[PDB]
Amino acid sequence: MPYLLISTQIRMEVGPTMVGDEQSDPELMQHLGASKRRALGNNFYEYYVDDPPRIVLDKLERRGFRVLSMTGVGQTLVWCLHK
Amino acid sequence: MPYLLISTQIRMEVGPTMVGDEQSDPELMQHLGASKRRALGNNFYEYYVDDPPRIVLDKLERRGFRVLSMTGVGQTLVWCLHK
Amino acid sequence: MPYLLISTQIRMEVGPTMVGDEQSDPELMQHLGASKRRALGNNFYEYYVDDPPRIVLDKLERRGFRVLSMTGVGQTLVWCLHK
Amino acid sequence: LPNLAAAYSSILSSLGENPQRQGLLKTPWRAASAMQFFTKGYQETISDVLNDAIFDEDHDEMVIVKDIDMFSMCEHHLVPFVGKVHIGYLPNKQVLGLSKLARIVEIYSRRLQVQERLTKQIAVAITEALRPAGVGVVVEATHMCMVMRGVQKMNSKTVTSTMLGVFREDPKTREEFLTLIR
Amino acid sequence: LPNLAAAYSSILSSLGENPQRQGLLKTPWRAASAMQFFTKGYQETISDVLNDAIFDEDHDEMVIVKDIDMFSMCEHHLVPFVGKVHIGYLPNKQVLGLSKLARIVEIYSRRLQVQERLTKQIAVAITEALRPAGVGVVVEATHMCMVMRGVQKMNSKTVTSTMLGVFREDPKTREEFLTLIR
Amino acid sequence: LPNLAAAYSSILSSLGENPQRQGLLKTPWRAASAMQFFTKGYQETISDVLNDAIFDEDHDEMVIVKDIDMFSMCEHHLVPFVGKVHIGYLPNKQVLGLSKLARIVEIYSRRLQVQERLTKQIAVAITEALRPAGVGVVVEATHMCMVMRGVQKMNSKTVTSTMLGVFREDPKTREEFLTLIR
Amino acid sequence: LPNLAAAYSSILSSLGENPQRQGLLKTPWRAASAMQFFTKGYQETISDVLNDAIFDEDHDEMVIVKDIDMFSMCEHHLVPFVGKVHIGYLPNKQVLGLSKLARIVEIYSRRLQVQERLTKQIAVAITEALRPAGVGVVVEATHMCMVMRGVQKMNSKTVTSTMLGVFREDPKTREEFLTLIR
Amino acid sequence: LPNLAAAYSSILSSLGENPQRQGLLKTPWRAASAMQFFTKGYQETISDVLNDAIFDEDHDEMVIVKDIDMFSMCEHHLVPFVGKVHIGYLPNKQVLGLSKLARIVEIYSRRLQVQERLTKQIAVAITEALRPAGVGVVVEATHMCMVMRGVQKMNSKTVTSTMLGVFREDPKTREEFLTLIR
Amino acid sequence: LPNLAAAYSSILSSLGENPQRQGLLKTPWRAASAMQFFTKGYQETISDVLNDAIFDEDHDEMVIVKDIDMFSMCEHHLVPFVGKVHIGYLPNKQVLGLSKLARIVEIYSRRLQVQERLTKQIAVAITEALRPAGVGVVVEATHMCMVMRGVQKMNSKTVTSTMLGVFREDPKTREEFLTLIR
Amino acid sequence: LPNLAAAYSSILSSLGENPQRQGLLKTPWRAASAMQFFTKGYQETISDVLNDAIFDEDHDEMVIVKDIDMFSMCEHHLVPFVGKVHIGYLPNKQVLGLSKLARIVEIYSRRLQVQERLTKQIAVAITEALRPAGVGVVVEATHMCMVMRGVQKMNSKTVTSTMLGVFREDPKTREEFLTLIR
Amino acid sequence: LPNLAAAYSSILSSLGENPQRQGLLKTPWRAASAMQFFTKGYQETISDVLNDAIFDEDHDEMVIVKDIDMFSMCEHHLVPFVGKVHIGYLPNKQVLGLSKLARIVEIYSRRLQVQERLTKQIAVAITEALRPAGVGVVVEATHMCMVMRGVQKMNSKTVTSTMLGVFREDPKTREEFLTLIR
Ligand SMILES: Nc1nc2c([nH]c(=O)n2[C@@H]2O[C@H](COP(=O)(O)OP(=O)(O)OP(=O)(O)O)[C@@H](O)[C@H]2O)c(=O)[nH]1
Ligand SMILES: Nc1nc2c([nH]c(=O)n2[C@@H]2O[C@H](COP(=O)(O)OP(=O)(O)OP(=O)(O)O)[C@@H](O)[C@H]2O)c(=O)[nH]1
Ligand SMILES: Nc1nc2c([nH]c(=O)n2[C@@H]2O[C@H](COP(=O)(O)OP(=O)(O)OP(=O)(O)O)[C@@H](O)[C@H]2O)c(=O)[nH]1
Ligand SMILES: Nc1nc2c([nH]c(=O)n2[C@@H]2O[C@H](COP(=O)(O)OP(=O)(O)OP(=O)(O)O)[C@@H](O)[C@H]2O)c(=O)[nH]1
Ligand SMILES: Nc1nc2c([nH]c(=O)n2[C@@H]2O[C@H](COP(=O)(O)OP(=O)(O)OP(=O)(O)O)[C@@H](O)[C@H]2O)c(=O)[nH]1
Ligand SMILES: Nc1nc2c([nH]c(=O)n2[C@@H]2O[C@H](COP(=O)(O)OP(=O)(O)OP(=O)(O)O)[C@@H](O)[C@H]2O)c(=O)[nH]1
Ligand SMILES: Nc1nc2c([nH]c(=O)n2[C@@H]2O[C@H](COP(=O)(O)OP(=O)(O)OP(=O)(O)O)[C@@H](O)[C@H]2O)c(=O)[nH]1
Ligand SMILES: Nc1nc2c([nH]c(=O)n2[C@@H]2O[C@H](COP(=O)(O)OP(=O)(O)OP(=O)(O)O)[C@@H](O)[C@H]2O)c(=O)[nH]1
Ligand SMILES: [Zn+2]
Ligand SMILES: [Zn+2]
Ligand SMILES: [Zn+2]
Ligand SMILES: [Zn+2]
Ligand SMILES: [Zn+2]
Ligand SMILES: [Zn+2]
Ligand SMILES: [Zn+2]
Ligand SMILES: [Zn+2]
């Protein structure tokens, strides 16, 4: 799985950071220290780390990912990483 | 720490500019001339410079950072810099 | 000064275009034909050209600038140019 | 009931009343039966109430049921608070009947409650019944333990508000719910 | 108070609750002190309350004090009823202060009452204090033992009305009282 | 004024304040000049105010001037009460100007008053000025010494009402005044 | 109190009154006790008032307490201003009781205040008590030092508004608070 | 018109203005033509206006024409006052058209008036036109020479009221007119 | 004043009046003094009015002063227009007093104005006084030169609106100002 | 209908229109069928409409049918007037059905009418149908030949009122009809 | 006019009337002159109406003129529809007078219209007059060809809405226009 998508809400200087969905890599989320949850009303699972999103981008570079692009949609800021 | 995130609000021709969070480089914020504060109600610290964001991008190039991408989310404009 | 920031409001087929702030290059704004103003209530000066933003990007390429990225924040569309 | 009927009998003797006069003869037996009406929600269950009234239809657009009247009993001071409940949901190929949305509220408001807990329990009970795309609940209420006794703000009115599903994720879905209820 | 604090403790055990959880620990001791606030009118007396505030002045024209808020406890079901009290009088060379007219109401509404009895006791307490030419009392109220439980008429609102003196004898004196309160 | 300016200076020291901070420097000299605005009615006189504006005309029909705003200072607690004044009269071949009816009120409300006394003094001041066939005065008011402090009835509003001349003798003349002001 | 009772005695002599008449005998001793009611907030403290009423619960949704009535004393002219306070917060696994939100206001409004300072102090007192995710405060008020005296705009009404936490950072969280209070 | 056009030209020079700027060039000639619109009632006559529109019919029951808008110029301060006119009459085998009742008002309000005189002249003009059994006229108005300048009571609104014929003699005929206009 | 007193004397002779009757004797001298009240704003200055009432405080949140009543004179037809002014600002470590915001309006509305020019001059006068982060001004008004004369639209009401600073640049700052004034 | 269809065809040519464009092709045939709807009351008769719905019952108490909507055509200008009809009667051992009271109005309002004649014809048609003890009719209406064209009073609204039987003889029977319709 | 006077004469004969009675004698000549008032907009022109009243000023902020009353004639059924017009524009260094905005409407509403066409023609007439940055037009109306005849929905009210310029391109410019008109 070469592509990877992380996002964060209201401010970028604080977590939590979304790092993956149902079909993500279980070893990679274990290296990032991710926990798994389902918010009420949602039909899907999601992984999250409590680190600020700058620290997660420094972890994911050591594994081999490079930031393609960044977007802001809504009140969310999304980074798209390619290996 | 290769990645770095700066942002500015309502207009881009005037400061102040956010330059970092709790775990940023203390020598790099000292070269930029940053001050540290916590706004009331927030649970986190942040660094800021009072310069317009074009002047901060000319400082950060002399240290070795290159602008990957820029986004606008909300009323904030975010630059993502990689060394 | 390698970096440069231009923006335009409600439509991209018509001006005026913002081209700089207080500390910009006086020869470069003179080549672009810029005028200087301060809107009431603002604490800062700004330069503007009345040309549509496609014509300004064709001027700034002949001087040596290349478009890094483009963003839309609010009702404003921002181009970031690097020399 | 005879344990409650003796339990209000010790209250009337404790306040300096006389339980022997004509007004206070049936007062132990009428007030105790009104305390089992106000807490009769515990013996009710979601499955017994919905009564197989979940209808299959391709209508995936918003349904708002406003001005539902609740009447609850506070559990710190045992003094009532009354108000209105506003419920809206996005059905996902299954529509619930409009009476069972107002009969769910009767289960959870007829208990000893706290308004923050009362708001959340209706929205979770609608989620587990239908599996919809999103639920919203707004509850307005006036607390008689703030109007009568204590601070005596006769005009105060606490509002609480729970959004689940795509009422929480989508901001253009919550701005429509808050407009039609007006 | 410790007899009332034990008296609500047998109610909480009788409804199927658990008195051990965090919401219901101080509930016997907070609700029992709120039942002595709602019936604290018995220890008050007219002479101690008026505080020598009866003023001598030649003003023999009508004085109406409207929108006084009362908050009483019914004595059949022990469930509150709230409302507004409208009082008007014709002073006979002695004017009473406007606060003591609203502090008389606090004596008689903070009891276990019935609205027909509550209306008459205010008007007799004003007659014995001032000896005026006439007293009128109108009390509007909503009974929670008709809204919450029983018949469930959420909009019903009983009005009672006592006229004494020349509000009863003169019909042109009662038609002015009923107009200015509007 | 310097005796009042020293007189609020001993109040600020008595409440535990500090008169040296920036908010409380000009507070003795600004509040004392506002206490001479609230009691400036004593230096005014009816003859100096009417200014020969009494007009001769054969109009013997009713004239009502409603919604006049008064702002008075109570004289038991020295705390304001505000309200509206409704004045009506039957001119007897002499009409008074509509501004001087509202400038009479400024004389008697800008004093230390009691609302029963305040009602009667306007109606006697209009009687002695015009000699009309009848005067009516209705004053509504909210007493901040009943809303803020003491009993804390935020909605209460005392109405007083003086009728002189043929507003008192004729009942069909008082039922018209009470209708047009609505 | 006897220093204040002498301090209003020099005011009554300074305005041209007579302190010997029946209306102004107890006026030094009744008005001075009403000036210690209006500034009794200084002896109160946040820790003594909250009374261990902070409840642990997983409800992270918005809680708005609207129409809280305040009654403050201005500190430039010593003349009251009254109004309504609207408070909303996002609890972070700890809910505060609805009476203590309205009893915090009684601490800071019962002082000599300025409305810009009064708005900020409530929102900081709620932040330090709960550590919530965000606080909002809206205060409407009518200044009697603009209505009675000075400019005499009887309809003017200043609104101030403080947002902290994620009411300031998130714009979709402030647009919900401003809608439910309506 | 050229005498009025020179007459506002000396006003503009007297207030410290400059009549040479773009706003005040046509101001002498536009304001003077608006002063002949506001006083154009003098050239109109009752006989020329009624236009033979008096209809013969056996309808002897009450006819009320409410909410007629007038716009008059005061004659003490030359500053407008605006309001509503309520007219009712009992036709005596001759009904007047509903437009001519509102076109009579345009004759007498478009003059320099005083509201007591303005009320009486409409009712006498209807009496001399129809010879009816009774006429009633109620005029509400707000005087800008009391709101803008002088006393500055922005809410005050004087009502005057003329009754002729059997509206004056019969009290059951005046109590019906005052009810249907509401 | 004697030049204006002669200047309305030529108006009264030009309309076909008689200046010799009792109503029109003091009309040249009373109306001319009311035209110097309506244009007395020219002799006032911002520095003399603010009176060193700019207070230093760390409150950087929104301050809205609504329902300020203005009363202006149009300068095309010399006929009044009245309305309400809504002003809001974001103070930048300096708060202005709430009376001086309403006393700025009295300077610029008491002139011969045009509503588009009247809106802009208040917002520039607040900018030069405080240097705030943003100013907003909304002015509603009814033009008597559209209601009385000309087109005769009695219900029309023009609104104008000036935003400066970050009320113009930020759209989430203008959507809050437009909500609290409602 | 073809004579009316040609009769609006000469109107469209006379105003300077073009009857050949797409909007005005079916305009002669659609407007002429709407003029036979507005005057279809002539072919209806009281006996054919009542349909033997007069019910025998011992109820001799008042029956009021309020807010009946009428829509009539004036017969001077051929321009509509719309309004509300209020009918009340005292049945004399024969009750009429509530639909036939509103279907009588459709007979007489769907004609070319004058409002004084329209009021009287309903009350006489109810008298001849039931023989009751008394009939009352109140008709409110807005005339578009006073709002659109002519005087242009957009707010005016003429009320007419017919009382027959013991609504005319007894004054305590007419004061009840005028109260319940409110 | 004599061709229209004969054209309503064939209508009155066609409905079964009698044109010889007193009500229908001047009905051909009064109704035909009212049909030339309702369609008198055709002889008016934009250049003749604006009358050189376009004023040069640096005010580039929003100007809204609300509650303009229109009164139009439908062109399918020749039956009126009435309503309100809301117009707002952004002037580009040229302000139009507030009367000429309401006198433009009189040109286009006094025709045979369709509401979709009526909305667009006002906004194009304002664009060609001023060249502004943006125009908005909202027209509410009640169609008497839906209330009286046909479907008979007495409460229905069609709204149409045209936005040009930067009211169409910018969404933050249209959300301000829709808020101030409320
Ligand atoms: N969504 C929707 N539900 C409707 C409509 N009309 C209508 O009766 N219902 C629902 O139809 C359901 C039928 O309920 P049911 O089969 O359990 O039997 P029931 O009548 O005895 O229930 P009840 O006690 O609530 O009246 C009710 O719950 C009611 O909410 C409608 O137009 N839309
Ligand atoms: N009739 C009348 N009474 C007034 C006026 N203003 C005013 O304070 N009063 C009365 O003055 C009385 C003075 O009461 P008091 O001598 O017993 O002492 P107090 O202030 O401590 O009583 P409190 O607890 O009711 O405030 C109050 O009861 C109040 O009703 C007024 O304008 N008219
Ligand atoms: N009854 C009546 N009085 C009127 C009318 N219009 C009008 O200005 N007045 C009165 O005319 C009087 C003229 O007052 P004045 O000769 O003492 O002089 P003034 O204008 O300086 O008095 P001010 O200070 O009250 O304005 C005012 O008191 C005002 O009430 C009106 O239509 N009816
Ligand atoms: N959030 C919330 N709080 C509630 C509810 N009902 C209820 O009484 N409370 C709070 O329960 C708290 C219990 O207060 P406490 O233990 O300090 O004792 P208390 O009754 O003597 O306080 P009091 O003087 O405010 O009445 C009150 O502060 C009140 O706000 C409810 O439904 N929701
Ligand atoms: N009482 C009564 N009068 C009516 C009705 N309908 C109606 O048009 N009228 C009157 O009919 C009269 C006819 O007036 P007219 O013969 O002088 O001619 P006109 O239309 O040119 O007058 P205008 O300028 O007032 O419109 C109008 O004055 C109007 O008041 C109605 O239902 N009842
Ligand atoms: N922001 C704010 N200003 C206040 C409050 N209370 C209060 O009196 N002020 C202001 O305090 C200022 C004090 O004015 P000042 O020193 O010039 O003297 P002043 O009273 O004679 O002025 P005045 O003629 O306007 O009454 C007033 O302008 C008033 O607006 C408040 O709570 N907040
Ligand atoms: N007084 C009275 N009349 C009633 C009641 N309910 C009710 O339907 N009616 C009347 O019963 C009558 C029955 O009318 P009908 O025998 O002529 O037949 P219908 O239904 O076809 O008439 P329709 O066209 O008016 O509906 C109606 O005219 C209606 O007014 C009621 O409670 N009281
Ligand atoms: N924008 C604006 N226009 C104004 C104001 N006051 C005022 O009279 N006007 C305009 O001034 C214009 C002057 O019109 P004009 O020179 O054509 O002459 P006029 O008075 O005879 O026109 P009229 O028939 O509309 O009254 C009017 O159209 C009116 O809209 C104002 O405060 N703002
Ligand atoms: Zn409680
Ligand atoms: Zn009961
Ligand atoms: Zn008092
Ligand atoms: Zn003050
Ligand atoms: Zn006047
Ligand atoms: Zn004008
Ligand atoms: Zn007509
Ligand atoms: Zn049609």
PDB file of C-alpha atoms and ligand atoms in Angstrom, chain F residues 30, chain G residues 73-81 113 143-146 149, ligand 12:
ATOM      1  CA  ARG F  30     -19.454  62.129  38.348  1.00  0.00           C
TER       2      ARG F  30
ATOM      3  CA  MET G  73     -24.039  48.479  39.687  1.00  0.00           C
ATOM      4  CA  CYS G  74     -21.998  50.633  37.338  1.00  0.00           C
ATOM      5  CA  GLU G  75     -18.778  52.034  38.765  1.00  0.00           C
ATOM      6  CA  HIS G  76     -18.536  55.355  36.957  1.00  0.00           C
ATOM      7  CA  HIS G  77     -21.898  56.815  37.986  1.00  0.00           C
ATOM      8  CA  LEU G  78     -22.951  54.329  40.767  1.00  0.00           C
ATOM      9  CA  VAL G  79     -26.264  53.852  38.929  1.00  0.00           C
ATOM     10  CA  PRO G  80     -27.570  50.339  38.110  1.00  0.00           C
ATOM     11  CA  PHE G  81     -27.611  48.449  34.851  1.00  0.00           C
ATOM     12  CA  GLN G 113     -18.501  46.568  37.380  1.00  0.00           C
ATOM     13  CA  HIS G 143     -27.452  51.293  31.271  1.00  0.00           C
ATOM     14  CA  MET G 144     -29.532  53.684  33.364  1.00  0.00           C
ATOM     15  CA  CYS G 145     -26.644  56.167  33.048  1.00  0.00           C
ATOM     16  CA  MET G 146     -27.609  56.343  29.357  1.00  0.00           C
ATOM     17  CA  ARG G 149     -29.281  60.901  32.581  1.00  0.00           C
TER      18      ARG G 149
HETATM   19 ZN    ZN L  12     -22.374  54.398  34.436  1.00  0.00          ZN
END
